[PDB]
Amino acid sequence: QKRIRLGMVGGGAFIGAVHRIAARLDDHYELVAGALSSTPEKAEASGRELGLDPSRVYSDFKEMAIREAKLKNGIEAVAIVTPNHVHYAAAKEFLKRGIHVICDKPLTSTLADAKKLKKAADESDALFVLTHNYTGYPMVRQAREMIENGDIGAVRLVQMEYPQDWLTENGGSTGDIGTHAYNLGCFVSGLELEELAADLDSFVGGRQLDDNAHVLMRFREKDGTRAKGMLWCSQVAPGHENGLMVRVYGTKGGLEWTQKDPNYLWYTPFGEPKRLLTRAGAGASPAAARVSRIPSGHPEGYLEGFANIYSEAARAIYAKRADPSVIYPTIDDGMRGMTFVDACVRSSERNGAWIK
Amino acid sequence: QKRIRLGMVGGGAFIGAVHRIAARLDDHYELVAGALSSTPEKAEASGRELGLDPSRVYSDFKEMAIREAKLKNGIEAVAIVTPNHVHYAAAKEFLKRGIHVICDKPLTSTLADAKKLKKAADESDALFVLTHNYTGYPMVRQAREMIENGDIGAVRLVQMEYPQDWLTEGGSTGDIGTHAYNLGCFVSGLELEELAADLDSFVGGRQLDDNAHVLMRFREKDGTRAKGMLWCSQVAPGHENGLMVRVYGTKGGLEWTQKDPNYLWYTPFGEPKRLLTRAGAGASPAAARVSRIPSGHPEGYLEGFANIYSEAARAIYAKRADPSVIYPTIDDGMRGMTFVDACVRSSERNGAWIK
Amino acid sequence: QKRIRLGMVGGAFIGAVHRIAARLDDHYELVAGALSSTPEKAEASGRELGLDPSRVYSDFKEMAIREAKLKNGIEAVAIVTPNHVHYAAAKEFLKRGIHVICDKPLTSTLADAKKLKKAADESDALFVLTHNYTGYPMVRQAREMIENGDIGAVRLVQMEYPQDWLTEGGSTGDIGTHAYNLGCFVSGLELEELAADLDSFVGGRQLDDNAHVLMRFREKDGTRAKGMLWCSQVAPGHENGLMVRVYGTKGGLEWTQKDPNYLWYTPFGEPKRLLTRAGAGASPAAARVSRIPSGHPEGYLEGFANIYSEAARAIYAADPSVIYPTIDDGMRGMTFVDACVRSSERNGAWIK
Amino acid sequence: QKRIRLGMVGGGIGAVHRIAARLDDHYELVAGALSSTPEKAEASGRELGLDPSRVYSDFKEMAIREAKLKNGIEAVAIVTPNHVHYAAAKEFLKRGIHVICDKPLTSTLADAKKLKKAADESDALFVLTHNYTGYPMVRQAREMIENGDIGAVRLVQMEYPQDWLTGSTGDIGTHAYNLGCFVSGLELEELAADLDSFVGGRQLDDNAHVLMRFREKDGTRAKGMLWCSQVAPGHENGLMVRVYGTKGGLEWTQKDPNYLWYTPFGEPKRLLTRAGAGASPAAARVSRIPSGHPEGYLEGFANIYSEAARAIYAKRDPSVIYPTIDDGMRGMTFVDACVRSSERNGAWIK
Structure with missing residues (x-):
């Protein structure tokens, strides 16, 4: 071509x-x-x-x-x-x-x-x-696959964060990093957010936009379980350069991934030892390979x-x-993203009210 | 004696x-x-x-x-x-x-x-x-000290969690939620003002909660009203006993995980993050007094x-x-009990903020 | 009782x-x-x-x-x-x-x-x-699995033990032995001969504060294994870092004592596994020396x-x-310290 | 342009x-x-x-x-x-x-x-x-020791194990060798080696243990150690090097390359990161993203x-x-000095 x-x-x-x-x-x-x-x-x-x-x-x-x-x-x-x-x-x-x-x-x-x-x-x-x-990321996509095949069963928990520290001093976090955490969340989990409750802050005086968000999350019921999660994003958390991370918990096991060490996917089947899955190494699924370039x-x-x-x-x-x-x-992923941001803002303004 | x-x-x-x-x-x-x-x-x-x-x-x-x-x-x-x-x-x-x-x-x-x-x-x-x-734990008491001296400035965020996985197949808030709440208030040295909770009883037949998600609003202090989160859970394959606390302030941050209780991660804003160790360089008086071996x-x-x-x-x-x-x-105990109550009260009310 | x-x-x-x-x-x-x-x-x-x-x-x-x-x-x-x-x-x-x-x-x-x-x-x-x-329970799980041939025949047995405290009777006898003894405890192997290079890095100090040591073990399940041993009292960044890694024909194991409840087991051509004290896949030998969940x-x-x-x-x-x-363990321990000091004085000579 | x-x-x-x-x-x-x-x-x-x-x-x-x-x-x-x-x-x-x-x-x-x-x-x-x-941290590591940030060098500890074949000294030994020299700022003087071909039918080596002796530099006459191996399960591509000096230590693993572990003797250990606080100029020039x-x-x-x-x-x-070309040469010499020393039952070669 x-x-x-x-x-x-x-x-x-x-x-x-x-x-x-x-x-x-x-x-x-x-x-x-x-x-x-x-x-x-x-x-x-x-x-x-x-x-x-x-x-x-x-x-x-x-x-x-x-x-x-x-x-x-x-x-x-x-x-x-x-x-x-x-x-x-x-x-x-x-x-x-x-x-x-x-x-x-x-x-x-x-x-x-x-x-x-x-x-x-x-x-x-x-x-x-x-x-x-x-x-x-290969390992992020492997997660999606694994979860689609039911390697951890029904999803109960999706735990998501994205702290950074660059605004400790001196459009807000929900829209800039929050959405990534959200979108990473749904992509891996295979779930639909149904409603959320958000507490937003602009800590840095002089700053009109939100620079931290705590979000309680309720998901549409899939597979007989009604999953929950939380989401945190922040631009005022010293010690964090770019710590997007996603954690998923099912009825059969869990999956943990941290963008800063992207080549690793932590897999624990319930009742078994936790296993360290690697990009291009053993345990690497098809979906991972297709976007892997090196050993x-x-x-x-x-x-x-x-x-x-x-x-x-x-x-x-x-x-x-x-x-x-x-x-x-x-465009629908981005569609979902914007609904997410709008609803966080509406929530926190309405003092943490549930919104869909 | x-x-x-x-x-x-x-x-x-x-x-x-x-x-x-x-x-x-x-x-x-x-x-x-x-x-x-x-x-x-x-x-x-x-x-x-x-x-x-x-x-x-x-x-x-x-x-x-x-x-x-x-x-x-x-x-x-x-x-x-x-x-x-x-x-x-x-x-x-x-x-x-x-x-x-x-x-x-x-x-x-x-x-x-x-x-x-x-x-x-x-x-x-x-x-x-x-x-x-x-x-x-000594590093837990060192965190309490450094935050008390001003080492990380005015406290802004307290992020608490406590997941176990034993009940995957008296509830989590009262068993483990408390330890986490207590750890949070212990290290950050702040008073919780109000909370909102969402409690679940995932397992069929289990009446008591086996998971909780809680948003936290703290009493203003050093001219700053901190907020936080608490998760605990008994149904999270991967976690054996993973109590953890992270604390962010105007000058820096501190993180401590109880599974590797001998370390404290200290990063001052703008600066490389440091590895603080029990009985090692950078150990403070508060940890020292409760440490026995080198x-x-x-x-x-x-x-x-x-x-x-x-x-x-x-x-x-x-x-x-x-x-x-x-x-x-006993007062720490009491707080603990007002805390569980308010979680259960809030959650029945669909996460109403409770004092 | x-x-x-x-x-x-x-x-x-x-x-x-x-x-x-x-x-x-x-x-x-x-x-x-x-x-x-x-x-x-x-x-x-x-x-x-x-x-x-x-x-x-x-x-x-x-x-x-x-x-x-x-x-x-x-x-x-x-x-x-x-x-x-x-x-x-x-x-x-x-x-x-x-x-x-x-x-x-x-x-x-x-x-x-x-x-x-x-x-x-x-x-x-x-x-x-x-x-x-x-x-350590996880140190005993190691011995239990290798004995049973979980990582097949042993080929390498890499040991070390740096400390940082004398940065300003030497390391071999003091810490070198602990780790010689740990490597052996875990592998199930008998040292045959060694070859060793020692230093007294700090001026004024007479005793050796560092040691590098090549290692050869007796044939066992067919394979004739080797290993190395580093110990030190002048390596900043180490407080008490005894560590042991054993590689076989079928897998490998790593345990570090500063984080003693973990034992890293990877079976060949399979994803590495984090075994824990009192956790899933805690072996018998571990349980009998564990108190809490x-x-x-x-x-x-x-x-x-x-x-x-x-x-x-x-x-x-x-x-x-x-x-x-x-007593025989403490004995092999002395012979080791002996051979090393012998071996270095003759510029790295193999000894037994 | x-x-x-x-x-x-x-x-x-x-x-x-x-x-x-x-x-x-x-x-x-x-x-x-x-x-x-x-x-x-x-x-x-x-x-x-x-x-x-x-x-x-x-x-x-x-x-x-x-x-x-x-x-x-x-x-x-x-x-x-x-x-x-x-x-x-x-x-x-x-x-x-x-x-x-x-x-x-x-x-x-x-x-x-x-x-x-x-x-x-x-x-x-x-x-x-x-x-x-x-790698940016690896250049940051070289820069700091150049700068005497960890004092005179005493130890250069370097290894490189892989697992896929469960000729080593030439295929990976050299990377390990050069990287230690690159970071350390030293010249190897002599080495004693014990090479091995476990796997049957393999003619070449798939393991190597080797002690190292460098040339007196700043009053200290560093020693190091080196292990490479293609038969060490658990290891995907474990290139790593650690350098200990009179005032400090530096550690770096290529599987997690964006982190440099700096210990100033007497002080708490620090996690240095690519493009982060405490990243140094040598790193800056070769980094592209935040x-x-x-x-x-x-x-x-x-x-x-x-x-x-x-x-x-x-x-x-x-x-x-x-x-x-020279780095290249030092490398060819290294591998030769190895095989040579091993054949002579671990004799110190130059």
């Missing part, structure tokens, strides 16, 4: 560098165009910095979808990587015109925009991929994870010219 | 073997008496087993207390290891007749008795000590228990005391 | 540990003791331990004889003196039929170690060597107490499950 | 060098000699989408034609097995083409001595892919490719480090 002609909006900036890495890694893409800043001097510079044909460097995402859709050489797919109050204005321009969009988390900035974009995205024939990179003991990590999303989206894109083993996060 | 003559009620069962080791370990106590059972056939079997003078093996704590108070050679303190509904009953007899009581947790089974049992201990001139064994030689669960017996020993010698002596009181 | 009357010569951290290891299981009661040479310290300590002053001696020789006569006389004695005072103190109690629990290592000199093995053979009282570290950490003392109790059990006799470190 | 046209010889682990190369966008891969049989070569040029103009079946030819081209590769990646290294590399070195070669240097001490000749002659760079020297976002084994590999790149750009920075 011919590499996918890829554009970018936003970037210039870790998150730009990450997406561009994610797309070089498995060599499924070539990055040929970009509107990476709204103020032209900066755009032109950034293109200059990436080696982009200046023919091919814009400063208007709207201008850039119009021309590129005409171009015979035009982009086949676009990574949207603006701040999220702009995800919707941007993606609808490309989806509108048959260009696949690979969008960064969370979906939007408001529930209103989330709903519109779904509609846009649903109307289009172009693919729409949401980049929840953490569902991308056991040879640490894959965050970028390899992000790339897993770009590679699946690719396998799908090709099939727009589809393998049922291909997974990636959808 | 002449040893402490000690009696027991109940045990004679893990629980009783543990207090007996906890008493023996530091050599502060000779165990001389005991109502080890309600049926006399056992009570004598138990006594003969513990190698006790049958003169001194009873089968009725009330008799046992009446007799030992007047007995001149008689027990100076007693350890109550019965089930919770019995504590108040058992304990009132001994505090009446002025002998000291080392009680197992929780205080009671009902709020009403706990209420009584405070009035008994408040009236008495004897000591009441409660075995929140887990507050006996760094690297693991202390543990029996030793955290023994620390509570010995802290109590110290206070007992002072009644024939150092400001350094600390042990869980 | 009447508690064993025990007396003590010597002891100091080390005296305190033994008295705890005595008290823990309620098997023993401390009646007599000669805790010092100077009679002033020896009255005082007795006074503190609340012993009977009638029972406080200041010479171990007067102690054996007197106690040996008495009908309230001690049924056993804990020897916790320095190394060069072991043989002297112990023989006096074995002569007269009172049991001896001696700390490690056996003696300060190989020659005395030979004399003592003799005194112990002749004698009809038991001789327990407190190689405490062999008392899983997840409730047991430690140094409990293990030390394990020895004391197995000593108890032997004394009450003897259940052929009751194992403890023998 | 303009990418570096790149060739490769081998592959068809080639994938890893290809990943390493793409990762930072410094190279474009244009030509290749991915196999000896001329069809398997075309096919693989085809799997990768190389212009068939530029798919070769013999390296010597490839080198020639490319050196002539105006589209000629500016660098070649030699990823063939060891015994082919020299043949290939000398053809690109001869003609001004930089060569990034995978380890080890060669399969004979003879061959090696010749490559150093070809390398030293050439004006093209010779880069040896010691990926593990690539603390807590784990970089790994490919990232370490792409770090060597990205320092070669920087080296190349010049020859068109005293910060830019990479493993040289």
Whole structure:
């Protein structure tokens, strides 16, 4: 197959560098165009910095979808990587015109925009991929499989967290990290959240947005058990760089995974010794392998994870010219995300009331 | 100093073997008496087993207390290891007749008795000590100290948990929820103001909760109103006995896991995170006083228990005391009981915040 | 069963540990003791331990004889003196039929170690060597599984023991032995020959504070195994890090004493398994030396107490499950320390 | 600024060098000699989408034609097995083409001595892919000891066990050796080895124990130890190294590469992390994402490719480090000194 002609909006900036890495890694893409800043001097510079044909460097995402859709050489797919109050204005321009969009988390900035974009995205024939990179890890996907086959039986408990420390001093945590924890939660567990209760705080004086969240969680009944969970996210917890973690408890055993040591999945069958499952090592399931690149003991990590999303989206894109083993996060996952955030905010404002 | 003559009620069962080791370990106590059972056939079997003078093996704590108070050679303190509904009953007899009581947790089974049992201990001139064994660990006491000095600044978050997996196939809140609550309040040194809970009885036929999820709001302090979470559970395959506490403040954070009780993870904001060790570099006075062997030689669960017996020993010698002596009181016990009550009250009300 | 009357010569951290290891299981009661040479310290300590002053001696020789006569006389004695005072103190109690629990290592000199093995053979009282570290339940699970061929035939037996305390009689004899002895206890193998490079890193220090040692074991289940041993007193970051890893044809095992309740077992071509004290897949040999449920950490003392109790059990006799470190163990221990010091002085020569 | 046209010889682990190369966008891969049989070569040029103009079946030819081209590769990646290294590399070195070669240097001490000749002659760079020297913490570890953060070095304890074959000293022993030297800042002086081939029918070794003696440095005459092994179940890829000095200690395991364990004697042990607090400049330059976002084994590999790149750009920075022909040589010597010493029942060799 011919590499996918890829554009970018936003970037210039870790998150730009990450997406561009994610797309070089498995060599499924070539990055040929970009509107990476709204103020032209900066755009032109950034293109200059990436080696982009200046023919091919814009400063208007709207201008850039119009021309590129005409171009015979035009982009086949676009990574949207603006701040999220702009995800919707941007993606609808490309989806509108048959260009696949690979969008960064969370979906939007408001529930209103989330709903519109779904509609846009649903109307289009172009693919729409949401980049929840953490569902991308081999061991995270193995968990999903294991649980789907009932390796720990009915789910009773889903315990989820995501503390960081970077705002100890000096849109909030629920929307930025909280949603990842939530989405990681449902992805692994196979459950639907039915209702939640949230206590949010902005600890850091001067700060209007929530920088910590405690959330009680009630799940829809699957398999005769009505699962519960909790969720914590925080940006004021010294000692934590990026400690996303998920813990699942069934009627037959448990599964523990920590993003910071991603190559490990802790599996304990009830009545048995806990077993340490490894990426690419024994016990590694099919679903894990399909996104593994190197031998056991040879640490894959965050970028390899992000790339897993770009590679699946690719396998799908090709099939727009589809393998049922291909997974990636959808507009409905992002749909769910925004409902989650809205409801946390509504809850805490209503003093911890249950919301669905 | 002449040893402490000690009696027991109940045990004679893990629980009783543990207090007996906890008493023996530091050599502060000779165990001389005991109502080890309600049926006399056992009570004598138990006594003969513990190698006790049958003169001194009873089968009725009330008799046992009446007799030992007047007995001149008689027990100076007693350890109550019965089930919770019995504590108040058992304990009132001994505090009446002025002998000291080392009680197992929780205080009671009902709020009403706990209420009584405070009035008994408040009236008495004897000591009441409660075995929140887990507050006996040196790193747990070092955390309490560092947070008390200002080491991590004003406390913002207390994250508590306690999962076991034995009941996968009297409930979790009262059995283990308390230990966790107590650990949280012990280390962070804060007063819980209000809570909201969601309690589940996952197992079919099990009436009592076997899981709890609890949101915590603490009394403002250092100009900061902290919040927290508590999970406990008996149905979580993977956890044998995983009590844990994590504490975040304006200046840094501290984490302690009871399965590896000999370590304390201290990270000051902006700085590499440090590994704090029992009896090692960076060990503080509070830990030092309750440590017996050098760094690297693991202390543990029996030793955290023994620390509570010995802290109590110290206070007992002072009644024939150092400001350094600390042990869980009746009030700690009471808090524990208001806590369980409020969880159960809140949860019936669909997580209403309760004071 | 009447508690064993025990007396003590010597002891100091080390005296305190033994008295705890005595008290823990309620098997023993401390009646007599000669805790010092100077009679002033020896009255005082007795006074503190609340012993009977009638029972406080200041010479171990007067102690054996007197106690040996008495009908309230001690049924056993804990020897916790320095190394060069072991043989002297112990023989006096074995002569007269009172049991001896001696700390490690056996003696300060190989020659005395030979004399003592003799005194112990002749004698009809038991001789327990407190190689405490062999008392951990998870250390005994290790021995139980390897014996049964759970990890097939042993190929490698990697041992070490760094400490950091002398960063500013040396490590081999002091800690090197503990780990030689642990490797053997666990594998079931007999050392054939070694080759060793020792250092006295710190200026002014005469004794070696580090040791690297190559190892060869006797053929056994067909395979002729090897191993290495590092010990040290100058490795910052280590407090008391004894550790042992054994690899076979079928699997491998790792145990570290700083986190003693865990034993890492991986069977070949299968996911590694975290075995725990009192937990699922706690083997028999583990259970019989465990007090409390899983997840409730047991430690140094409990293990030390394990020895004391197995000593108890032997004394009450003897259940052929009751194992403890023998005189011959302490003997192999000396020969090892001997060979190493020999081997280094001849620049790494293999010795046996 | 303009990418570096790149060739490769081998592959068809080639994938890893290809990943390493793409990762930072410094190279474009244009030509290749991915196999000896001329069809398997075309096919693989085809799997990768190389212009068939530029798919070769013999390296010597490839080198020639490319050196002539105006589209000629500016660098070649030699990823063939060891015994082919020299043949290939000398053809690109001869003609001004930089060569990034995978380890080890060669399969004979003879061959090696010749490559150093070809390398030293050439004006093209010779880069040896010691990926593990690539990791940010491993460079942080080197920097600190350079800086005397743990005082004079006394111990260098290093091991590398794997489990898959339940020739070792050459396949993994050397990585362990070089990494210890890389981090430690020392020169091995002499070693005594005891090598082993447990598994029947295996001619080569699959275990090695070896004591080590370095050359007096800062008044201290360090010692170390080294174990590698391919028959040690439980171990996937257990490369690890620990260094103890007069004032401190450093520990690092490659299976959890983002953590460096620093103990300052007398003080509590510290967990140092990639891009985290207390990360150091040597680490900074080679890290791509924030603390807590784990970089790994490919990232370490792409770090060597990205320092070669920087080296190349010049020859068109005293910060830019990479493993040289010499590191390669020291390695060939090491392995020889081993086998030699073992055969002589563990004799100290130099």
